[model samples]
Structures are given as structure tokens and as C-alpha cells.
Target chain A: NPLARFAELVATAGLQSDVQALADSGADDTTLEAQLTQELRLAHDRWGLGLLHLQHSARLIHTDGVPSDIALLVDGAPRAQLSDGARAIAGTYASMQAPGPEGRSEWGILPEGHRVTLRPGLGQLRVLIEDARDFETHWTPGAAQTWTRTWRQGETLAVEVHRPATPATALAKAAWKVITSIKDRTFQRELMERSNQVGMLGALLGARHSGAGDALNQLPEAHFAVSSAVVRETGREGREVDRWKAMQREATETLDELQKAATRRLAAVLSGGLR
Target chain B: PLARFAELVATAGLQSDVQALADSGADDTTLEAQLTQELRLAHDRWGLGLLHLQHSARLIHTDGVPSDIALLVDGAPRAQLSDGARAIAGTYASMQAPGPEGRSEWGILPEGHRVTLRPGLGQLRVLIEDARDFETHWTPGAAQTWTRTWRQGETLAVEVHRPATPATALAKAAWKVITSIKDRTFQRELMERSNQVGMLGALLGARHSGAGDALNQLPEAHFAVSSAVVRETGREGREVDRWKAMQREATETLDELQKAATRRLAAVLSGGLR
Candidate 1:
């Protein structure tokens, strides 16, 4: 009944292709080998295509072992690895629903006779592997949020963890994921160039603070330093007044140029009716 | 000869007065006479010297009713008027002489003339006359033309005429006037003030142009309009998405006191420091 209801939900979400694929593969194929060869292939294709619009890319990989597993790759890097049953249920759930209010894509999968849920958050994706032994795995934008997991076999409970030296370093690691997800070369280049400038500016602002690497301060010296940097980079000349004039002129010219470019681009896009 | 130029032209009255005239239930002949008499007074008192400061200007007739009038100035360039009979008329006009200190200030006035002297820039003399004559104006137009007219129970022909001048020449003239403001503090303050004013103006323009409402209703579509306006007014090759991200980050970075200061600064700028 749940599977039937899931089929209805998928249909409501306009995922007819997924439903059709499942129908073609035959719902009765419950064996690992048959499901892997037939149902898994269809389900994976549907899931991958569905994810492609929201994400840069999606890939499904199968492992050959005693209890075979499937892995979900987001933007070409492995994000989650799951058991055979988990993979099927996840594929079904993915096809059944759209992104939630938080822009989160989620799945409710079954593995080892227990329900598991996977959902993506701001900078991480969480997977709750619920079974005889309940465990959670978190995949961040950069790396695993935790490593060296431990659980009690009988009475004593134990835990092990590894974390980045500083939370700031997590941002650096996150950059890798962000970069990988950008598909356009020109956009990526421009973003990187501008980001470098922003980082430099931020560092300059930070240096003006009393303490080393402190957040931006509202000190007069800090303001003067920041203003001076702006003036220098903008190629302003003369005394403060002249520099200000030059800055204004430069700002106006820059704004005008941007405006013209935007207009032309808008006209082009509107005329083309969008690609 | 070092020349000074002045020109006088009659335009429509305020929107309220125009609406009053339209709703007065007066006969066409009576209404026409009233419109002509009111416009004639406006024409005589029209502060032609006001246009002398800026490189370009636009005067709109806010009210209904049509009138014909001609202008003559002693030191200014030849006057050109278009669409005089319409509800609104705009003129693209310029002057030849520089302000005393070489700095030129552009604005609209209600009536009476008052000149505000800046440290280095000469003096900005604004003449407040009966009703607001010039609604808006800008510089740097070469061979640019615009026209519009409307008709209801009676006919109104609005025209716009701009004198022919090279765009490059206008730019040079503007630069000369700007550079004349030699006082370092005055020029710097003016520039700083203008930047804030410009931002406030952009925000106001967006609101009045209905883009603000659009933003509230449909953010995606609103972004396109915002981007277009920014490009037209700010810079080329700037990505709207990145700009938006930067705006968010900047807003987040500012503390409560800073935000309060920004709001206070915006209020002062909008109050017309210039």
C-alpha cells in the first residue's frame, strides 16, 4: 500500500517517467540480482535525471560484495553509500517528492528492515541509518563532519570524533564543494576573481582591528585605512577632496557602464525568449 | 566675448491645479483663457537663470489645459521649445557661462531665488517661483529626441525640444564646471553627500517605478528589473546574483548602531544637503 501510495505521489509530482520505468521493470522482481539489474537501473536513471536540474550532476555507483551497496554521487563526488534495500527505497522517495520549504531534498529509505532518512541542509547532508544499531553519518560541503564512529556492543557506550582545527577552516573546505558545483567556466572565473578581491578587502579590514585576525572594528583608524584603500584602488588623486571627487566620478561611470550592460543583456534575453 | 545666457518659457502648472482645472466644469473657452493666463504668468516668472547652472534640464507641465508661449534670454544659447500645447512639456537646454567659482548646481525650485555658496565651488543660486517648473533633468545627450501628447475632452499637445550640442562637448563642459570647485573639503563633502543621495534616489526611483512592489510580489522577476536598473545606473558586467550576495553580506556585517547611522544619513541626504 505504501509503494502504491508512493507511485501516486510520484505521479502527482509529474514524475511519470519514474513510474513508467518501475512498471516496465516489474514490481515483483524482489531478488537482489534482478532488482540490481532491472529495477535499480531504472530507479537510478530516474533519480539522477531528477536531480540534475537542481544540482550540477548526479551519479549512481554499485559495489560488488557480500551485501552489495549503492552510492549517490553529487556533482561527481560520492556523498552517500547505502545497502541494496536502502537504494531502492531512496530512489522511490526521491521520485515521489519535491524539495521542501528549506530547499531540502529528502528521502525515506528502508534498509535492514528499518526506515532511514537522508536530507541536505545548508552546508551538509545528514543520513540517519536506522536499523538494529542506529547510527548517523553527516557529509559536509568539504568532508565528513565526523570520523571514527563508535557504539556500544552490549553495556558500555563509546564515541570517537575528529574535527577541523578551526570552524573557519570548514569554510575553506566548503569552497571545494562550491567550486565543483559551478558548471559555467566564465562564471566560475569571474566569481573566483571577485572573491579574491573581497577576501583581500576583508583581510585589510580585519588587520585594522586591535587584535590579530579579529573581526572588523569601528575604530576611526580602521575607517581611515579602509577609505584609503578604496581611494587608492579606485585611482583617486589629489587631496581628500579631490580624491573624493575622483571616487564619485569613478563610481558614477562604473554605475553607468553597468547599467548599459544590464540593459543590453536584458534586451537580448527578453528578445530571445530565454534559452 | 565672455557670454551669459538666459531663456524664459511657459509650462503647465502643478498636477493638483491641472486636475482642478479639468474637474472645474468650466466651458472650453473659459478653461482655455484661464489656462493661458496662468501659463503666461508662469512663463514671465519662469527662472531662466535656473537652467544656467546645469548642462541639461527638463520642465514638465503637471496640470491639464494648453497654452502657447515663447522665451528669450540675453546671455544663454538660442531657445527651442516643443509640444507647448500638451499637459506636459520637456526641454533639453544648456547654458554657456560658468558659475562664479565654476561649480554648477542643478535643482528645481518653488519660488524666490536663494544662492548657497560652497567653499570652493562658486554658488548654487536657486530661484523659487510659483509652482515647481522643472521636474527632472540630466546632462550628456547628443541628437537625442523625445515626444509625447495627450487629449481628453479638449486637446493638449506636449512637446520637447533640445538644442543641438555634441555629447563629448557637454562632457568636457561638465568636467570643467566640476573641477572648478577648488575647495578640497567642499568638493569631498559634495561627492560623499552625492553618493548617498544617489543611492537614496535609486531606491526612491525603484519604489515609484513600481519595481519595489514587484520585488515584494515576485522576487525572481523583481531581480531582473533590479539588475537592469543597476546596470543602467551603476555598472556593466556586474552580476546581479553576486551583487545581491554582497548586499546581503554587507547588511549582515553592519551592527545595529551602524544601521541606525545609515538610516539617519539617508534621511539627511534625502533632505537635500546640496
Candidate 2:
């Protein structure tokens, strides 16, 4: 099935419990200048293509690397504004790719004495210090194509990725589901919220990154291909943020139904024939 | 800093050297049949995960039309189509709705009127219109259907024109999406991509909502592996010289599209970074 993973994400997102994921960059780190410098590398990796939801709220401090415009959410709330320190840090990150640590982040203190021990990873890319953030690193180890992340924008309320289960426990528990059974007003709100979360994720991570073509230029081939462009345009295309809604709509959930569906979907994913 | 467009293509599971359809690819039904079986492998070669576009609804075809043409194109009230030969009202005689009550585009087609398709000597009276309004009509939130078919005049009197096949329609759809990047600015490029959904649906078939139909649906939809449609019409012309041209056009156009897209792809990737 072309949508095996997508279906799995839909069927399991609300159903599965949480787990803490490592950042895509936790395993590795590159310079802001390097990320931009290695533009195609990032694009192919989907490092900065779509929206990225943080499993947790991370500190948004500046690094000596490079900086790009980023939109964010704290437990679902967008980083509404920025402080002078944060803004200053953002600008500094934009051009501070000094020849020092190949590490993409830098550490600096604001005028009033704020700390900026910067690091870039997946799980906690918080506000850009402006709003706080992180995640593309954790969900997926290398690149940031975490659009399938079950959790919404940010871990605002509770830990969405981890619950301290070990490998064996994890395997034993892989066979599980979540609690929210019926779609209620609250569920709709969550859905609505999730929709906006992807919007913010895409916005900050993508089109909304009001930086020069430098940041926007960090797109991939598929990113530029007509295939992606059409959907980018909205009538209904631009309207919906993700297929989670359709999956939710078409999805028929029940214990047995979900189990059977998951089995089939997983089988398809494993068997392979992606479109 | 931009990724090498060439490398990104492969990363997205796409190939620039589009495999030209078999010379006999469009020749006979069996040739098409054999190729049909190879569609998967061919798509694989080009990294086309889905040889479909738009939504889940797939767009496939036969000689003059889809093998299940009856299931697709329907007629109006009094004027049901029937080939002078037995094939017309034979198996395809029934004009029942493709989906539930008036759900498919066929619904609007026969709405309060009748349709006709008969073979006569000197005059082939084929009435055509621009039903794209049906397109802008009901949509995701608006109303009933998602799939519709249309007819345009190839020759005010002798011909009824349409993109050769789902492949033809879809290739253009993709090309349109690519060319949409009119401005080099990120905003323009981004905006062009965002609005390309309907074209995808148009060729993908009706109500093109697939599991991953979420291509453009989400905000993070900016990244994709790209959907591809590689089609070759069966060497056809059961009868018409005009349709023969469509077949030739289909192949040539696919070639043109591939070449043009490759050229454009070069510009997009080349100009981005120093």
C-alpha cells in the first residue's frame, strides 16, 4: 500500500503511548554554515523540509553556526513573540558561522546575562531562544522527515515520546494502543490543533522561514518537483495541512479492526512498494 | 545553499533518464497488456512509487479509452451512446452511476439532459462544453463528487479532443506543477507548489483521496518523494486518424515533457546556490 507508513502513523498516533526520541542530529552535528553549505545534503535528508514536532520542549539558545527562521509551538502554543536577547541571538546565528567548532550551534550570553549553550538535535528544537525549540533530530535519527510524528507541535502538556520502557519492554509493548476511543468535541479540538501544529511545523520549517533564499534554498529536489508543488497550492490542496484528517475520516477504529488494519498496513510497509 | 537537483531526484526515488515507452508499447492491446504487467517495474526503474496522480483513485486506460470505459464516460437522458457495432449497447449498454446516487462526475454529465455518441456517415455530431465549472463547483468541503470527465473540440466538426490518456493528462499535471515555479523567489515557488492539487486529482481519477493523498494537504507537505505517471498508449486507432494522432502526441509529449522538465530541473537546481 502506498500509504502503509501514513496509515500506521494514523492508526497508531492516537493509539500508541509515548516514547522519547533522540534528535536527528544527536548522533551528529554540522555547522549552520555547513547545513546551508551542504544544502543538498540537508534537502535530500529532508533535514529542513516539512514541519517537525518536538516530543519535548528544548531550550532555544544560539550556536556559533548559522541561523534560519523557525516557527514553533510550546505544548501547542506558538512562540508568540521574541525577546531582544532572543532576536539578537537569532541574527547572530544567521551569520556567526565562525571557523571554530564544526558543531552547528554556538553558546553566547545576552546583554543582560542570558546563556546560549547552543546545540541542534531532533527532540528539543525549542523557541529559537525567541520561542524555544527542538526535534528533527530525535524522531528520525539522521534527517528530519518527521511529518509522521504522532505527537502534535510540542510536548506542552506531557511527555509524548517516552515513558521509560526498556528494549525488551519496548518490544513487548510494541503491541499496544492508546486511550482516546471516540472522536468527541475535545478530539476535534485536538485534531484541529494537530492540523495547526503541522501548519506551524511546515511554516517555520519551510515557507514561513522569512530568511533569504539561503534558508528557502535549503529545499530538496522533491521539494521543487511539480509533484510537491501542486499540493503546496491550496484550494483544498492548500487548505488541509496533512492527510491525518483523511486517515482519521476513512479510518475505522476498533480493537480488532485496528489490529487487523495495523497488521495489513505493517505488512505492506515491510513488503515495500512505496509511491 | 541548495541540494544538487540531480542528487535530490534520486533521493526522492526519481530518475531523469525517463525510460522511453516500448516502440511497440502503444502498438497492440497485448503489447499494452504485457507492458501493463511491467508498469510496476518500469515505475520502479524511474522510482515511480505510484504511477498514479491526484488521490487514491487510479487512472488507467485501453485502446480508445479505459477498458472499463462504460464505467467512466456516460450519456445524457435520451441520447445514450451505442457503437454502430455491437460493442456500444452490448456490454456497456447500462449507464448506471459509477458510485452511489449521482456521486461520480457522470452525475453532472447527465444532469437534466441527455448524451449521444452514434456513428453516422458524413456528420459525427459530438457536442462538447467546458465542464471545468464542475471542477470549481463542489470540492473537499463543498458538495458531492471528485471525479469528472470532459470533451473539447479538436476540430469543430470532426474531432473530440482530450489528453491522450491518464498518462498524458497526468504528465501535463506534473509539468504544470513544475513550471509553476515561475519566480525564483521562495515565496513564488512555494505558492506555486501549494496550489497544484486539483490537477493531480484530475488525472488521478475521481475523488482522489488516498491514504497519502495528504501530499499537499498538510503544512509540512513541502517535502515529497514525488508521484509519477508514465504511460504509453496502446498503438491504437481502432478507427480514427485523429486518435492516431493523439497516440503519436502522447509519446512525443511524454518525451517533450521529460526533456523540458529535465531542462527546467537544471535551472531550478543550478541557480539556487553559488
Candidate 3:
């Protein structure tokens, strides 16, 4: 049923290419599950692994309009390997998605399974494709952190294990994950709804007097708010937090109307209201 | 004559700045004085005298740091100063009449070899290592009459000088095409791609070959842009921080890949007109 639901959503969203790519991945259920988990872990590592999500006082320095450094005060060290992996993923994703015009053409060979979703002026979404030898080694729990010794200097950069999470930290992590799950679900649902709306728009436009004018004036407005919510909830406190919240609320209100109008008009068209 | 004298003093000021960099962090006053003397000899030879020192100091204090300015800090490694720290890097010397355009020249001992800075039409000419090491030649034609000189060294130095004309401009444009292939980015990428097969030959080409030609060609670009145009970009905008960052990164990256070749090239250019 879940697979069928996923299929329905894919069909509704017209994500045939992505779905086909997933199918061609040649993975069994166990392999697919593992791949999905790895991608999720990569997503967490690259995009969501930092204490910036919960910590109030984290500061990022901007030099020449580029984020030069990110420093966060911590009561204890977090998992260094995990943190490193996350930062690498985030950095890599940002580089890929926000490529300069000259470099954009060079990225066409990026693997199909490895997807990047860009929220322009915000940040990025990275989906790690599969478990190659490189991917597997990076994710293994004990192997996350490594150490080295330097000659003539004691200041060697190394990775060490983070301590077990305290109750508060654990709760914070859980809260973040819950929000992430909800956001992902919302995105998936919207994609499914959009597929149905796309088909209905085609039908309604087919029955219209003039396609251009009616399509411009009568076609349902597009609504996308889930990402706006994520930005608001994930931003820093005070001015940044208030600003994102305002954006989210405005976006939510606009999208609600859009979704409602599209659903109603599509329902009317399907019910022989074209007469 | 006053203008030429000012230019020489300005150059000497640059050398003094380079000297400050050489003298920094050495605790012994004797060592600092010795370094200052060596640097002063280079400055004096370059035609900057005591009268111009005040202006040069003000310029240093105002300009803060020169872009692509590298000094041999701690006797070997090139150290660049941050904005706040640039005051520690360079100083200025006074101005004086450089004898006469052609007659006035001075010589300095560098690594035991004498190098001379002789006055040229608009700039100081350098005879590095030895005179025969460099040659100047002119080809005459109705369409494209020009002077082109080639100097032999760790890197070949080529100078093409002529009045602004359509014919010389065409030749220069052609020269640019030949030189573009030797640009830092192009050379670096080419070396990276080819070095696996060619090893040191590719490494040598990437690091050393045609580098002096590029530096020699820089004056054309610098003079091409009007001072008015640069002024429009704003004083802070034209200030040295961003330029310093770019030059420091480029120099550091080159130092990592081709230490031996870069040092030899720097020795020639930094000795002359700098």
C-alpha cells in the first residue's frame, strides 16, 4: 500500500524521470532501504547536522559577502566525523547548486540519483545517491573520526568521538528530526497535488474561450510554503527569526488560497461543470 | 626633470617598503641596520633620494600595502601583512636628481653579482646579472616599426616599446594571443593535466616559462586604464585589501607547486623597477 501510495504520488507529481531513475538503481528492498537511510544520513550530515538548528547564540562571519567562518559555543564536543561529513556535504552541495555561470555547464554529468534541490537565496537540498566504498566508509559509526600526528607541531587537525548526548541535547535532536519528517511529507504531498492540478489545468484550458487570457486570469495560482516554514523555524533568533516567520506566514496564506482554488476548480471540471 | 626625480623617489620608497619587510622580527638592532643598509643601497641605486622620503612615507601610510608586494621575510619565506600590520612592512626614502636620463645609473651587489638600474625614456631600465644576458633590437617597417628585446635568464624578459599606432597595436594584440596561452590559469591547468606524463618538463613550463613576459606586459594594461576611471571605482574600492588577498593567494599557490622556478623569476623582476 505504501509503495502504491508512493507510485500514486509520483504519477500525480509527474516525477516519472526521478521514479524511473530510482527503479533503475537495481536495488532490492533491503538495498533500497539502506540507500534511502544513507541519503537521509547524508542529508542530515550535510544540511542539518549542526547545533545551529537548536543553539541560540551561534554566529557566522561574512567577509566580502561570503560566509567565511561558523563558530558555535558548545558545552561539549559533538561527533567530529559526523560533523565533518555534514559540513563537507553542505559545502559541496552549495558549491554545486550555486555555481557561477561559467561553471554551470560542467555539472551536467552529476549522477541522477545524486540530486540537488536549490532554494535560491536560502540554501540547498542534497540527496546522496548510493553506498559506494567511499560513502560506506564515511558513514560507519566508529570510523567517523580519525587522528594523525604532525612533526614539529602539536597542532594537528584530527577527529575524535563525541560523548553520548545529554537528555536536553537528545530532545533537541529529536525535535529537529520530527520537523524534518513533517517538512519532507509536506513536500511529497504538494508534489502529488501538483500533478493532479497540472492535468486539471490542461483540461480547463482546453475548454476555455481563449487560452492565454483565461489561463492567466483563471488558472489556479501556484503555492509553495513548506520550505518557507523550514527557513523560519531553522533561522537564528530575534531579527532573523522574526523575518523568516513573517515570510512563512505570508507564503502560507497565499498558498492556502492557491491550493483551495486549484482543488475546487479541478473538482468542478471533473464533475461535468465545463457546460 | 622634477617629475622623473619624483618617479625615482617613488620607486625607492617601494624598495624601502620591501626593506622593512626584510628587517622585521629580527630582534638585534645590528641585524636590522644591516638589512636596512642593504635595502637602502638598492633604493639609492634605483634613483630615489632623501628629499622624496616624506612623500613616500605618507604614501605608504595612506596606501597601506602594495598589491603583489612580497618580501623575503625571515631570509626566505615571503610574508604578507594584514591591513593593520602593513605599517611594519615598508618605509619611504627622499628624492634627488638622478644625474641625467642616460648618464645617471647605479649598481648593487645581489648574491655577489652586480645589477644596474639605468634610466630609460619613461622608466628605469634594468641590466640584470650582466648586459649580454639581455639584448634590445628593433625591426623597422612602414606598417609596424617597433623595438623588441629578449633577455636570457631563469625566465626570458621581452620588452616591446613603440608610440601608440595602429600597426604596433596590431603586433601587440598578436603578442597578447601568444602570451594568453602562458597565463597563470592556463599554465596551471595545462601543467596539472600534462605533468603526470611529462614530469619536471611540464612543471618547469608551468612555473617558469614566459612568466617574466607576463610581468613585462603588465605596464601596458596598467597604463591603458585612465586614472579618472580608477578614481571612479572609489578610494576604498581601489585600496589594497582585495588586491593583496588575490596576489597573496596566487603567490602562495605558485610557491607550493614550483618553489625553485618562482624564486629565480622573482629575483629578476623584484630587483628591477620594484
TM-score of chain A of each: 0.17, 0.16, 0.21
Best by TM-score: 3
Per-residue CA lDDT of model 1 for A1-275, tens digit only, reads 22333233222112233423553565532432333333333332222222312222222333342223344444445554433233353444345445545333232111111111223431111111111112222212223322122221112222222221221222233343354446888766665665576653333222233442232121111111000001122111221233334543453343334323333432332223222
Q: Sort all candidates by lDDT, best to worst.
A: 1, 3, 2
Stretches of candidate 3 above 4 Å error?
Answer: A1-14, A17-275, B1-15, B18-274
TM-score of 2: 0.16
lDDT of 3 at B265: 31
Tens-digit lDDT track of model 2 for B91-181: 3224322233222233222232222322331111111121111111111211211211122212211111111222333344445544545
Residue ranges of candidate 1 with Cα displaced over 4 Å: A1-275, B1-29, B40-46, B50-274
DockQ, all models: 0.00, 0.00, 0.01
TM-score, structure 3 vs. true: 0.18
Task: Write down the RMSD of candidate 2 (Cα, Å).
Answer: 31.6
User: On residues B1-274, what C-alpha lDDT tens digit does candidate 3 reach at each position?
Assistant: 1122222223222223324443465433443344344444333222232212311111113355423222233233232223211232222211123333221122111111122222332111212111112233332223222222222222222222122221222233333333446477865664465446342233334445564355443322111100000011222222234323433443343233222222333343333323
Q: What would the DockQ be for model 3?
A: 0.01
Index of the highest-lDDT prediction: 1
